[PDB]
Amino acid sequence: SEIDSTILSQCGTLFALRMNNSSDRNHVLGAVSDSFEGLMGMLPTLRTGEAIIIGESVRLPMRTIISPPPFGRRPDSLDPDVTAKWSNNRVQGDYKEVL
Amino acid sequence: STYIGTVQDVNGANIRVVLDSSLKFVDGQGYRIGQIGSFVRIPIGYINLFGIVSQVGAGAVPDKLLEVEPYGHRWISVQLVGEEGIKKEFERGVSQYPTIGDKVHIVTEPDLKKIYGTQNKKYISLGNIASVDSIPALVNIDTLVTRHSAVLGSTGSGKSTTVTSILQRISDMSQFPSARIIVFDIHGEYAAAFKGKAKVYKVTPSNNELKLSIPYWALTCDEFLSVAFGGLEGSGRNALIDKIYELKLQTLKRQEYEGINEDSLTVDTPIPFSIHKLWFDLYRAEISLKVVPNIRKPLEGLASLLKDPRYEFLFNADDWSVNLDGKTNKDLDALLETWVGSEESISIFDLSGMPSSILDTLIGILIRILYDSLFWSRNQPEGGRERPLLVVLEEAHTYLGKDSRGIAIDGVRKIVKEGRKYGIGMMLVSQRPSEIDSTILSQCGTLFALRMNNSSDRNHVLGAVSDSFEGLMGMLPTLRTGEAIIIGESVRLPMRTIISPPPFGRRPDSLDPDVTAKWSNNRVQGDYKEVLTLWRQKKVRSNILSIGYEADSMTLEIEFNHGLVYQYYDVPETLHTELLAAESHGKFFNSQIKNNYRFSRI
Amino acid sequence: STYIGTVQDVNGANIRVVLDSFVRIPIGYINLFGIVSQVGAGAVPDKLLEVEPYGHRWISVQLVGEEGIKKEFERGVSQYPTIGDKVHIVTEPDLKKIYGTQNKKYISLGNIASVDSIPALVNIDTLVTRHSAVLGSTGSGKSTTVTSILQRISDMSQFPSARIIVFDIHGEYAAAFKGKAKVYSIPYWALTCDEFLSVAFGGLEGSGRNALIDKIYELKLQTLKRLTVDTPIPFSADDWLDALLETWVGSEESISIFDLSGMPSSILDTLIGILIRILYDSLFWSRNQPEGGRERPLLVVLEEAHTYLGKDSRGIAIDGVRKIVKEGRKYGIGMMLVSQRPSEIDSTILSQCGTLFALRMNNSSDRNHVLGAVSDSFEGLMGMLPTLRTGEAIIIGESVRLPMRTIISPP
Amino acid sequence: SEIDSTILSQCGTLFALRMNNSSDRNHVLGAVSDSFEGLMGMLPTLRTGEAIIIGESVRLPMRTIISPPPFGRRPDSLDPDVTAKWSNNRVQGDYKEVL
Amino acid sequence: IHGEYAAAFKGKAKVYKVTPSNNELKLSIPYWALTCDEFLSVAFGGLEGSGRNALIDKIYELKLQTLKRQTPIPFSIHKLWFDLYRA
Ligand SMILES: Nc1ncnc2c1ncn2[C@@H]1O[C@H](COP(=O)(O)OP(=O)(O)OP(O)(O)=S)[C@@H](O)[C@H]1O
Ligand SMILES: [Mg+2]
């Protein structure tokens, strides 16, 4: 719902995944060429991985489960895990180093 | 009676049901068979299709049937939410949608546990669920901290107590011995919740309490000029910047600091420099301890600031006061250690006793001292990567305005945008969501919605929620006191919990002067000459748990709850020993002692 | 028996009822309540009009609060109603309970519009500490209402040691307070230097300002023998200090007034600012004494404020009023805003007034602004403003459990 | 059909005359409690001057022919008579007065 | 609203036209009988901004002036026009 409508309408293909709130669902329906009654009503409960691909890149709209990449080849961000860090017993620190 | 009826319509994401019979208010606890937000389930073959009650009554019957049966309404609309695995787990999304004529049951305790319970170690307990018995509300802790939070509601909703509960449950020494949290208390009420388990910094410390001091040389150039002078923009600004540079270079030549030399010295550098010498030298050219002597008006302004007890937390720091020679007893090491490295996890910078005019520019400064200090040591064992931090902000709608031009907005926006990498959280306690900038409220991860009376703010909340679920958001303006709707990515699904209130005696209360008490007691003549002798110099100098003893000054001393110290003057000591031996506390003192003798609180 | 109809639609916070202003819904052991939000042919479901647009027997009601087992009445509900439930009409005991409170912090200010027996209780502690606000119109006769409030919360029956001040201009309250309250000399040296320059000399700018500050400084010093410039020590007209303080705050009478009709309109803003600053500064330093605001809170009330709290007024009064609004809570200092034309008072100040009394309002701009500057709101509190009876008022704020319609009367 | 029903409801006595369109008969018959098929089905063939009175001003509703007032007392607007004013021979006129 | 009953009662009633004849009455509705909102609607169009407040206040001075010399009380437009247009 935040992407500029004119730009979003010039994308040939779409991979509509699970969509939760009632506003983005409508804004997506409002820029999809092959608005297809059968499949667009099941947007809000596609599982983790499903993707309704709609556009000219496919002859007829699909409902495909994207094949997951093999383990180890997954996207991950090395952000800290507070529960595993706040649990470690405190160690005396010298703040001369921080300053 | 795990049975309701048969699905009659199936729109893929909006099924409907036709209730069959009579509604009974189950006694003992009060849970009815079916509510507006109550969950439902549908066994399909071998798996379970769970849903939420979206609408009840004439609003769910299929449309044209109203023409068929104008006044026949027995239908419900259920929106199907997720699904259960084959004895594996609950996951969202549906592998296969239902057909017409299926069976629709009601949620039972094992399903309560399966949906709501989990096995990950991150999740913790923050109050049990409403409309069902004994189900702790599990909130992911990692996501809640690193993905930022928020609290919203009405004035009497009770958000301070919810925040107190969360902080109490998030810092217990049992599981999190090295926690760390900071609270920018403003009205000054949390300080009563954590009596002997947190550090509190005020402006007028008590006998067993600390003094908040923010040295004036820990500021950048822009911040310091903003606080002191209001942001000069002429050649006077250039003159003052050059003078600050000269003072810092001079002190560095006087004293040595690790790895700083004239080649890498800037105004932003946090090193000591004497304000008094600056003022005196910049004023002599236009004509120390004591302030007796084209930027003149600025220098009268700063001179007035120097000798002002209100500004005793900047220019007359307790031991961060800097001598003439740029020499201080202690460096910023002690300040950082106390603020974030102390032995107590939580610290409270209650800013109630601050000149409101600067309050905003004060908040920002602290947020800049912490972040900038936890960013340049992100590899050491004292940075945010090794012991992350959570910041709390009370009454955020005044500083995070959509159009506000202060500095706090910049700091909070920076923590929201860039705090993920370095483990910095944020918790915005607010009261009028529509005020808060819509770009920042859309980056907060989790939301603790509460009662909201205004229709103009409910719409804002509904329009700015990641999972705009309606079964749990059509009931915003009727929630109880403490009934919270948790929606975000910090929980597997929306929750409708009640927060376990903190035990009696551990609660926040800003000690406001109760007008009833101070106007019911009988009038006693005042010594206004004391008021004048106290104002000229610009200075301030039920239950009973102890009584002071003295028989030489003709005085009495008493202590109440909350650390209130009262000194009663001109009291003959015979009555002192009479009271002490009376063993009548709260009654004899009530009898003829409340309003007989003068007393001055200390 | 009393009865209205049956519930036929629910979406959590909004109910529809089909027939055979407050309303009560029973559940057994507990009692839900509510108010009729929308009525008429527009209340029916959206597409149910097409089927039958002329038979209207649907009423839309909003749940409001819950009542326990004769314990208390608290907002928000723990359960909800479902199809097949009953709806009654509010009776005398129901009003007796929802508006009846056992807390000692509540004081009676009047009665209900329909019923006269039950008082219109208000929490004085919040009314003083949080803040107050009275918005009215020329023909609403706000004077009698505010007088009744002032002399009803300050009676010597239960609050002998009250302390109030009125900054009245038109002098109308002098007649209202014959002898039951005081009525009214500001020294020319107490006020700060800059205010004195502004009031008398006309706001000098050049080096003459510096020379005059200098001269006043040495006159101030030489006064001491027979340290700072701003010291309120007398130096060498009656109008153009312990006794003055006691007369202002230490007087035996509970209330006090300041009639400023005769003074010029030009300097009156600076004078109100000076007075308010003096009071606040004195009661901020006297915090730790029996004379302080912590032991006898003070309340300030001023009328005709819409000419002083404008959106971009440059007077000194706005600064002191803002200081009271923000920091005055801690030191036990209150405030009360009376204004017959609130469209001019800035929103950023009117948004901080906890308790709001509304009187007869006719114009649309005022009716829009009041809704835009309120923390609570009900649908049954917008369309009846212009038809209010003289002497009635609508209370909305956090100092009352629920918003009310009440008539104020002297005791 | 278009008048407000809220203000029409409270009216006590009603006079109804011949009606042609089928959208107004429904509104008028929905404005009366005495739902009689005869009293609102014989409506669209009522001669000029006939009318049915329904309400508490009349003991029993029924159809009656209202007598006409005598010649010389009969409402009529004096709108121009085009056929008579166009039949007469063209008269040369001067528009200077009109301007 | 069609001037159709005037001929019904040749002499049994009295009519109030807007452009009468030598021997007929003239309808007269003094503006000042109107209430504030009605007058603003008829003469101006129901303004809301500062102009509405200015005119509402302006009426008050003239009304109270007339009353003190001797709410539905007479007052003059022309003086209003000149006074607040000369401004
Ligand atoms: N979960 C709760 N259950 C019952 N009472 C609560 C609960 N939480 C808070 N309260 C009480 O409701 C009153 C107000 O709640 P507080 O949280 O203390 O104040 P607050 O108004 O929410 O904070 P501000 O002024 O909006 S920042 C107090 O009497 C609380 O004791
Ligand atoms: Mg609070």
Residue whose pair of structure tokens reads 């159809």 in the numeric block? D63
Q: What does the alpha-carbon distance between residue D80 and residue D74 come to, in Å, rounded to a whole number?
A: 18
Side-chain-facing half-sphere of D32: CA atoms under 13 Å = 21
Q: What does the alpha-carbon distance between residue B413 and residue B440 come to, in Å, rounded to a whole number?
A: 7
Q: Which residues line ligand 1 (CB under 6 A)?
A: B 155-161, 431, 481-482, 499, 501, 508
Residue in D closest to E1 by C-alpha: D77
Dig out the tokens for E31 from the structure. 């503006």
What Å resolution does this PDB entry report? 3.3
CB-CB under 8 Å, E9 with D77: no
DSSP string of B361-388? Answer: HHHHHHHHHHHHHHHTTSSSTTSTTTS-
Taking each helix axis from N to C terminus, what angle separates E36-43 and E50-69, rounded to the nearest 10 degrees? 120
Question: For ligand 1, atom 5, which residue shows the shortest CA distance?
Answer: B481
Contact list, C293 vs chain B (CB under 8 Å): 513
Residue whose pair of structure tokens reads 């004078």 in the numeric block? C271
As beta bridge partners, residue B1 has none
Residue whose pair of structure tokens reads 């309970």 in the numeric block? C97
* Strands (DSSP E) found in B258-405: 346-348, 390-394
Residue in D closest to E5 by C-alpha: D75
Mark whether B and E touch (3+ CB pairs within 8 Å). Answer: no
Q: What does the alpha-carbon distance between residue B595 and residue D48 come to, in Å, rounded to a whole number?
A: 95
Beta strands B390-394 and B427-429, pairing class: parallel
Amino acid letter, residue C261: S
User: CA–CA distance from D54 to each of A7, D24, D30, D60 (Å)?
Assistant: 65, 17, 13, 7
Dig out the tokens for C83 from the structure. 């199809």
Q: What does the alpha-carbon distance between residue B595 and residue C146 come to, in Å, rounded to a whole number?
A: 32
How would you classify residue B505: left for phi > 0, otherwise alpha for psi between -120 and 50, otherwise beta? left
> Looking at CA atoms only, how far is residue C268 from chain B in angstroms?
25
Residue in A closest to B140 by C-alpha: A83
Q: What does the alpha-carbon distance between residue B280 and residue B266 come to, in Å, rounded to a whole number?
A: 23
User: CA–CA distance from B137 to each of C38, C215, C270, C377 (Å)?
Assistant: 37, 72, 57, 32
Q: Is the dihedral of CA A66, A69, A75, A81 positive or negative?
A: positive
Q: What does the alpha-carbon distance between residue C228 and residue C205 come to, in Å, rounded to a whole number?
A: 22
Shortest CA distance to B472 belongs to which of B130, B158, B136, B143?
A: B130
Q: Is the dihedral of CA B123, B124, B125, B126 positive or negative?
A: negative
The angle subtended at Cα C252 by Cα C251 and Cα C253, nearest 5°, is: 90
How would you classify residue C28: left for phi > 0, otherwise alpha for psi between -120 and 50, otherwise beta? left
> Looking at CA atoms only, how far is residue D15 from chain E in angstroms?
20
Cross-chain CB nearest to C9 (options B30, B32, B57): B57
Whether C378 and C399 have beta carbons less than 8 Å apart is answered as: no
**What is the B164 CA–ligand 2 centroid distance (Å)?**
10
Shortest CA distance to C375 belongs to which of C136, C131, C124?
A: C131
Q: What does the alpha-carbon distance between residue B420 and residue B426 come to, in Å, rounded to a whole number?
A: 11
Instruction: Phi first, then psi: give them for residue B4, nearest 5 degrees.
Output: -125, -55
Sort C356 into a burial class: Cβ within 10 Å, 0-12 / 13-18 / 19+: buried
Contact list, C231 vs chain B (CB under 8 Å): 536
CB-CB under 8 Å, E49 with C363: no
Q: What does the alpha-carbon distance between residue C299 and residue B360 come to, in Å, rounded to a whole number?
A: 28
DSSP collapsed to 3 states, B519-533 = HHCCCCCCCHHHHHH
Shortest CA distance to B497 belongs to which of B125, B146, B51?
A: B125
Ligand 1, closest atom to CA B498?
Answer: 1
Count of beta carbons in the 10 Å neighbourhood of residue C107 = 19
Whether C174 and C183 have beta carbons less than 8 Å apart is answered as: yes
Ligand 1, closest atom to CA B509?
Answer: 18
Q: What does the alpha-carbon distance between residue A16 and residue A64 come to, in Å, rounded to a whole number?
A: 10
C200 DSSP assignment = I
Whether B169 and B124 have beta carbons less than 8 Å apart is answered as: yes
Neighbours of chain B (3+ CB pairs under 8 A): A, C
Q: What does the alpha-carbon distance between residue B63 and residue B60 come to, in Å, rounded to a whole number?
A: 8
User: CA–CA distance from B104 to each of B17, B48, B49, C167 (Å)?
Assistant: 8, 10, 9, 69
Q: What does the alpha-carbon distance between residue B533 and residue B470 come to, in Å, rounded to a whole number?
A: 64
How would you classify residue C168: left for phi > 0, otherwise alpha for psi between -120 and 50, otherwise beta? beta
Question: For ligand 1, atom 27, which residue shows the shortest CA distance?
Answer: B160
Instruction: Phi first, then psi: give them for residue A10, nearest 5 degrees.
Output: -95, 5
Whether B148 and B448 have beta carbons less than 8 Å apart is answered as: no
Whether B404 and B430 have beta carbons less than 8 Å apart is answered as: no
Whether C129 and C324 have beta carbons less than 8 Å apart is answered as: no
Q: What does the alpha-carbon distance between residue B175 and residue B160 come to, in Å, rounded to a whole number?
A: 24
> Looking at CA atoms only, how far is residue B220 from chain C in angstroms?
28
Dig out the tokens for B102 from the structure. 């299926």
* Strands (DSSP E) found in chain D: 14-16, 50-54, 62-65
**What is the B189 CA–ligand 2 centroid distance (Å)?**
8
As beta bridge partners, residue C299 has C164
- The preferred substitution site among B161, B453, B510 for testing ligand 1, maximizing ligand atoms within 8 Å of CB, is B161
- The preferred substitution site among B160, B163, B504 for testing ligand 1, maximizing ligand atoms within 8 Å of CB, is B160
Whether C60 and C67 have beta carbons less than 8 Å apart is answered as: no
CB-CB under 8 Å, E10 with D75: no
- Residue C198 DSSP SS3: helix
Q: What does the alpha-carbon distance between residue C332 and residue B83 come to, in Å, rounded to a whole number?
A: 57
Show Cβ contacts of residue B106 under 8 Å, excluding neighbours closer than 6 positions: B1, B2, B3, B4, B33, B34, B38, B40, B41
CB-CB under 8 Å, C288 with B540: yes
As a whole number of Å, the CA-based R_g of chain E is 18
CB-CB under 8 Å, D74 with E8: yes
- Residue C333 DSSP SS3: strand
Show Cβ contacts of residue B581 under 8 Å, excluding neighbours closer than 6 positions: none
Dig out the tokens for B442 from the structure. 């859309």
C199 DSSP assignment = I
Beta strands C392-397 and C355-358, pairing class: antiparallel
CB-CB under 8 Å, C41 with D5: yes
Sheet holding C164-166, edge to edge: C119-123, C106-112, C404-408, C392-397, C355-358, C134-135, C336-339, C299-302, C164-166
CB-CB under 8 Å, B463 with A23: yes
Ligand nearest to the CA of B431: 1
Residue whose pair of structure tokens reads 């039958």 in the numeric block? C52
As beta bridge partners, residue B150 has B428
Contact list, E2 vs chain D (CB under 8 Å): 77
Ligand nearest to the CA of B161: 1
> Looking at CA atoms only, how far is residue C54 from chain D in angstroms?
7
DSSP collapsed to 3 states, B217-267 = CCCCHHHHHHHHHCCCCCHHHHHHHHHHHHHHHHHHHHCCCCCCCHHHCCC
Whether C389 and C401 have beta carbons less than 8 Å apart is answered as: no
Cβ contacts of B326-335, under 8 Å, gap ≥ 24? B326/B247, B326/B250, B326/B251, B326/B254, B326/B255, B326/B272, B326/B273, B326/B274, B327/B254, B327/B255, B327/B272, B328/B272, B331/A99, B332/A99, B332/B215, B332/B218, B332/B270, B333/A95, B333/A96, B333/A99, B335/B213, B335/B215, B335/B218
Contact list, C54 vs chain D (CB under 8 Å): 5, 27, 30-31
Cross-chain CB nearest to B468 (options A20, A47, A95): A20
As a whole number of Å, the CA-based R_g of chain D is 21
